[PDB]
Amino acid sequence: VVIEPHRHAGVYIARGKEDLLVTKNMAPGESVYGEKRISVKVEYRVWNPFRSKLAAGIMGGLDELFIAPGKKVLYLGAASGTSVSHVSDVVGPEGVVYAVEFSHRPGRELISMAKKRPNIIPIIEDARHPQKYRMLIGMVDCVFADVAQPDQARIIALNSHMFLKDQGGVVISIKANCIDSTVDAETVFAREVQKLREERIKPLEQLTLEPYERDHCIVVGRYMR
Amino acid sequence: TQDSNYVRTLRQIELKKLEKGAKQLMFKSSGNHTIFVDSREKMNEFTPEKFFNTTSEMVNRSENRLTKSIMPKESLDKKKLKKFKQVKQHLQRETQLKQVQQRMDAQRELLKKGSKKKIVDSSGKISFKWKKQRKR
């Protein structure tokens, strides 16, 4: 019944009968996807480290998660509101999330939750052409990547060279099978952090989020210039 | 077929209880955390509270580190462990129901029609191999 705060405001731990992680609301009153709602007068949505990917990195421990309540963030890979809902909760009504996806089959529910939250603005174009949404927004404070395409480093390199201000954050979730199967996660993740520090991304940390996902990692970095 | 329906809906009850019970727990992370540094002395040193900031309480469990109550001694701990045991016994009930419905379904599949033979393995686990003949 007791809510304690996290390292990043907008992220909390609801301790008590179930010591489980939680974010705020920017949706007044309702859940979006049947996540549990805790009230402590004030409404809270439970994040899940299995249903979502950034929550697994938080549960594994990300110190300088550049998603933070005074910014605006660019989300390249949600496909649906199940993570960008919590990112709009943690960034609050001060900022804005640009949830950019390509496959317009779950873009319907993406736009449907972007109706409810003005924090979330959608882009329904593929993230390897950022020039097609040049004229929509620029200069984000942190990019997020959840694309499971083979050219992850090139896609987020193009998006960060067009839309990320200097010394900002990069969080990239890397699935090992979408790049190279049959070889282990350690070599493919070392290969991808070297591929990403080929660009102006100083790698800060990687972690493997093993109880939540098989053969994944979350890599954070700071955009040099 | 109706007692197979009974066992199948019992299995689906335990399946849904399993998934929406494990949705409302929190599991301790176990991930190979890696930190990238400069030349060699930053690697030689202790990573001096770069994200721990206490080496006693907020270093070695990572579900929430920090930057600076109804019997919290054992009551909440036993309640936590007992809810974990509830999910584990939901899992045991679900796998036993899956096995018994699988044997029931094999028996029902066996008594339909077609030609078949009793195939015996090394152990004694019998199976029934059906003749290659399509259905008229």
């Binding site: 304690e4 731990i13 | 206490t54």
Partner: peptide, 27 residues
């Protein structure tokens, strides 16, 4: 720094002891 570091250690212990385990962790 005594009144800051001692109170920070006391608040950190009074938080972190109320979500932890010693013999229940392996269980």
């Amino acid at each position: 720094r005594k009144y800051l570091n001692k109170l920070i250690k006391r608040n950190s212990q009074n938080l972190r002891s109320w979500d932890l385990e010693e013999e229940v962790r392996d269980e």
